[PDB]
Amino acid sequence: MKAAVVRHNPDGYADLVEKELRAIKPNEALLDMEYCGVCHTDLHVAAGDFGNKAGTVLGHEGIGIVKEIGADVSSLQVGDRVSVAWFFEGCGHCEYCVSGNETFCREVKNAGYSVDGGMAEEAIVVADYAVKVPDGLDPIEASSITCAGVTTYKAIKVSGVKPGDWQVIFGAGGLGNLAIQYAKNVFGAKVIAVDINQDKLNLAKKIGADVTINSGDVNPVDEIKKITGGLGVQSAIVCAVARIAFEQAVASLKPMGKMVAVAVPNTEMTLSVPTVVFDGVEVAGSLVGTRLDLAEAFQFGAEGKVKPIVATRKLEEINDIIDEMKAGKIEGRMVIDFTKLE
Amino acid sequence: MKAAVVRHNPDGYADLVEKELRAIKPNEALLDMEYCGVCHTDLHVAAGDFGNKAGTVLGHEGIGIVKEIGADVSSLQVGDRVSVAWFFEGCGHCEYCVSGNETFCREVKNAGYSVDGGMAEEAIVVADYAVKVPDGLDPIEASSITCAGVTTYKAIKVSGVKPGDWQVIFGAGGLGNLAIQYAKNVFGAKVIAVDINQDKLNLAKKIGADVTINSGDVNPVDEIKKITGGLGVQSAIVCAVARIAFEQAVASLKPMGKMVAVAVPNTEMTLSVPTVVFDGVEVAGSLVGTRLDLAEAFQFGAEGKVKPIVATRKLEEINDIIDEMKAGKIEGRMVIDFT
Ligand SMILES: [Zn+2]
Ligand SMILES: [Zn+2]
Ligand SMILES: [Zn+2]
Ligand SMILES: [Zn+2]
């Protein structure tokens, strides 16, 4: 079958190879992939940024149909639609797994990085770890919920925001788009969206930001303080990569407020220690979520409470998509479409 | 009466002056002071780090005996022993005061900063905010618990350590010594202590530290990772005034560990955002403790679960104490003795 793999000398691009999968084990399933989103993380992995992963099949935003199950599998049956996400397998028995924090398992397998992923016509998954896609959830949208969706949903959980609190999202496009939809439509927060780009802010307004702030035209911090009534927001979710965003996010918190990073800044962030102490603020960050966070994130999509921006492309375009992504030309996700039929 | 106050041009030191206290209001009490500990925060205040507070009486580790009460006071009576802590008065009705988080009150009065403190022979307190010192707790010891002890007790609650977890305390001075005693004797943590001063570490070993690390001799981060079986600690309490302690603290945490900032050196710290994003780590500040945190912290001292290391000094000695503290010379707390 056809797969996108890391090149022998990782150079940022994929090779498109013929690959024959090994036979599945008793606890596994073989999928026929339908979709697989292309992510910034795929670019990093293909570039060698995390080590030389030559020959590894890319993709951790996969959606697929179970074609075969191993003899011990009871969770899935042939014909089920399931997911291939970043969190592909944990060991099941360590402190992180058993405490309910399995993405931190030290023996974690991540799809498209430390184990073959879903950017291929077929993939193997461990059955009990391939989360089912609910009926009601468009499967092209589900591919984006496996990464951007579960990340922003879980980040907003980690923030501790409760109905009626103010939360600000720094960065209106990309992840920010889905962060705004979850914050407003699922958690019942009052939402401020902050961005340098008016177009995207105009879009945020459409998908449920109560207030938008163009950060090129003003200092966001002073306006955020005014909007919330002097104090600041309960929490900030930082979706932007500009270090100034992280600085402004922290500066905007009311006392005991919490900043949750979902992106990492291009240059190192600093905190003023007397402010962290005298205002008791908290900084944390979040990446994807357990299988249960994923199930929940899917269910809100299935109810129509969030709607990711997606478009489809053919597998052969992988390297065009990579260049578009480096050039900054993509709103939301491009999603490789393996389906023949419908 | 004699008081130590912020200088007219704040320079890090005190003037000793004669002050006459105003008459008390109906919800207030007048104290004859017994003791007031010296805290690094007094030095930051006197240096102007938090703005110019020229003329304000310093001190927020005060212990004194109620001499007079206002007409509306029912919580205290003459002869009660009470405390004068950083959290000196909150508004009572804001979302911080009503949710169990009163030290974050934006209208807070802070002893020794925004209101006259306890480093003087007498002090006025707001009676319902002046937490009684339990019998069975030595007043000199109570002075340390009034700031050092309640700050670290509450910081250890904020860290979320549970019995059996590994916790590291950066800085084994006045704050860090008590932090070790609470983490070990009250919370049941396994405790690492990290400092550059070996005598403070030798003391840390005697009062409860399971492992001590001299960080002029070694890389504390690598050592911590070994002690704990490879991953690092569940939490780090930073009681150290050095920027690098804050950064070693973040680095020493296992995934989902939490760093709690207690010391307020006038510094920035570098925040490793990849560490919070990929390893789940949290950084939070903690600010002294509520009136109930202090009552709890005091009860542990009364029961002998913690024992503050203290030495008494004369008020006239306040500027000598400040230089000892800047030189890293103090074990435990120096306590001004008004008795
Ligand atoms: Zn992704
Ligand atoms: Zn595990
Ligand atoms: Zn203090
Ligand atoms: Zn208040």
Residue A308 Cα to ligand 1 midpoint, Å, equals 13
Residue A144 Cα to ligand 2 midpoint, Å, equals 25
Query: Quick one: which of B161, B165, B140 has its CA closest to B152?
Result: B161
Read off the tokens for B333: 């707390």
**Amino acid residing at A142:** A
**Amino acid residing at B331:** E
- Contacts of residue A278 in chain B, CB cutoff 8 Å? 264, 285, 287
Q: Which residues keep their CB under 5 angstroms from ion ligand 1?
A: A 39, 41, 147
Please tell me which of the candidates A255, A270, A274 has its beta carbon nearest to residue B271: A270
φ/ψ of residue A192, rounded to 5: -115, 135
Length of chain A as a residue count = 342
**Packing angle between helix A198-206 and helix A175-185, nearest 10 degrees?**
30
B255 vs B233: CA distance, rounded Å? 9
φ/ψ of residue B334, rounded to 5: -95, 135
Could you tell me if B172 and B193 are in contact, meaning their C-beta atoms sit under 8 angstroms apart? Answer: yes
Query: Quick one: which of B18, A204, B47, B57 has its CA closest to A213?
Result: A204
Residue B125 Cα to ligand 4 midpoint, Å, equals 17
Buried b (16+ CB within 10 A) or exposed e, A118-130: bbbbbbbbbbbbb
Cβ neighbours for A290, distance < 8 A, ≥ 6 positions apart:
A87, A100, A101, A102, A103
Read off the tokens for B87: 């959290």
Q: What is the resolution of this structure in A?
A: 1.9
Interface touch A104/B267, C-beta < 8 Å:
no
Gap from A71 CA to chain B (nearest CA, Å): 35
Could you tell me if A53 and A95 are in contact, meaning their C-beta atoms sit under 8 angstroms apart? Answer: no
- Contacts of residue A256 in chain B, CB cutoff 8 Å? 96, 101, 104
Residue B148 Cα to ligand 3 midpoint, Å, equals 6
What domains lie within chain A, and their CATH numbers? 1-147+288-342 (3.90.180.10), 148-287 (3.40.50.720)
Read off the tokens for A334: 């491009």
Residue A7 Cα to ligand 2 midpoint, Å, equals 30
Query: Quick one: which of B65, B63, B71 has its CA closest to B23?
Result: B71
Buried b (16+ CB within 10 A) or exposed e, A68-86: ebbeebebbeeebbbbbbb
φ/ψ of residue B157, rounded to 5: -55, -50
Interface touch B264/A273, C-beta < 8 Å:
yes
Query: Quick one: which of A85, A100, A130, A136 has its CA closest to A300?
Result: A136
Strands A269-272 and A253-261, bridge-based pairing: unpaired
Read off the tokens for A228: 């919330």
- At residue A222, the 3 state secondary structure works out as helix
Interface touch A270/B268, C-beta < 8 Å:
yes
Cβ neighbours for B78, distance < 8 A, ≥ 6 positions apart:
B66, B67, B68, B69
- At residue B12, the 3 state secondary structure works out as coil
| Residue A282 to residues A194, B102, B284, Cα–Cα distance (Å) | 20, 17, 4
DSSP B41-93: HHHHHHTTTT---TTPBP-SEEEEEEEEE-TT--S--TT-EEEEESEEE--SS
Please tell me which of the candidates A96, A256, A275 has its beta carbon nearest to residue B255: A96
φ/ψ of residue A307, rounded to 5: -150, 105
**Amino acid residing at B115:** V
Interface touch A104/B255, C-beta < 8 Å:
yes
Query: Quick one: which of A303, A305, A299, A284 has its CA closest to A156?
Result: A284
A314 vs A41: CA distance, rounded Å? 19
- Contacts of residue A284 in chain B, CB cutoff 8 Å? 276, 280-283
Chain A interface disruption, residue of B283, B286, B288, B293, most A CBs within 10 A: B283
Interface touch A264/B273, C-beta < 8 Å:
yes
